[PDB]
Design a protein around this nucleic acid. Structure first.
Length: 220
RNA sequence: UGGAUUGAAACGCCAUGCUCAGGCUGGCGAGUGCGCCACUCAUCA
């Protein structure tokens, strides 16, 4: 493999924090998990996986508030019930009761990122050269505007415009370390389905994330 | 074609600026003042 740097940008974005999920407050930047999820919406096969090495932030960080009427708890049943016939009308109250939540998103604006990513090979590989074929298929798809689904920027309410960046990583807005980003999520683990969080090295120009598949945490 | 702390997620239903009220009651544009004085349609077949 050689790595590939994709450019992804949009008007809105919401990479929700883990704490502030009900009244969403996004991270300042795209996290590695969201980035890999963007990638797997352009090309992905169960033979490969995506790892992220860097994420370049090319624009100011600017927040915005948008409240939406949203379904609340789909509350567990207090009394079991069954439909009168097989295929007939059944519903969900989205306007009466406490089934209207009005969640307030503190989502980003006018975001622009460049993701560096690579190709490991897992079980169900089939061969040891899958990296080349799949990397080149993804490159073709990025160039031709093709995709399995329109990538989002967090939620599907915000679609991501994506191009294949083959030139130099363009001028960013951050040339000296005036931002530290705190302590972010690395990538939701699925071997144990837990939350490994990584940030122990500052963000200088491009967030330098460790591979989620080798060092799950500084604890280990 | 697993998996973007994701995927599902109206701020939505309704509401008179109404009822009525003189811009009225009266007040000279008036009192005076030369258009005046003076000038050949002439001289000739």
């Amino acid at each position: 493999t050689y790595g590939i740097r994709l450019r992804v940008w949009g008007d809105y974005a919401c990479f929700t924090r883990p704490e502030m999920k009900v009244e969403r407050v996004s991270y300042d930047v795209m996290p590695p998990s969201a980035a890999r999820g963007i990638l797997e919406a352009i090309h992905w096969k169960p033979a490969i996986r995506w790892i992220v090495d860097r994420i370049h932030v090319l624009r100011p960080i600017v927040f915005d508030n948008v409240r939406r009427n949203e379904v609340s708890s789909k509350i567990p049943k207090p009394n079991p019930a069954t439909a009168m016939r097989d295929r007939k009308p059944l519903y969900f109250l989205v306007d009466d009761g406490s089934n209207r939540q009005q969640r307030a998103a503190t989502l980003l604006r006018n975001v622009d990122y460049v993701i560096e990513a690579h190709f490991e090979l897992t079980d169900k590989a089939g061969a040891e050269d899958n990296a080349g074929k799949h990397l080149d298929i993804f490159r073709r798809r990025a160039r031709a505007g093709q995709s399995f689904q329109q990538p989002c920027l967090g939620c599907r309410e915000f679609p991501a415009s994506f191009e294949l960046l083959e030139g130099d990583v363009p001028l960013s807005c951050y040339a000296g370390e005036k931002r530290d980003l705190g302590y972010m999520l690395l990538d939701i683990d699925f071997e144990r389905d837990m939350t490994p969080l990584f940030f122990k090295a500052v963000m200088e120009d491009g967030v330098i994330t460790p591979p989620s598949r080798t060092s799950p945490e500084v604890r280990a």
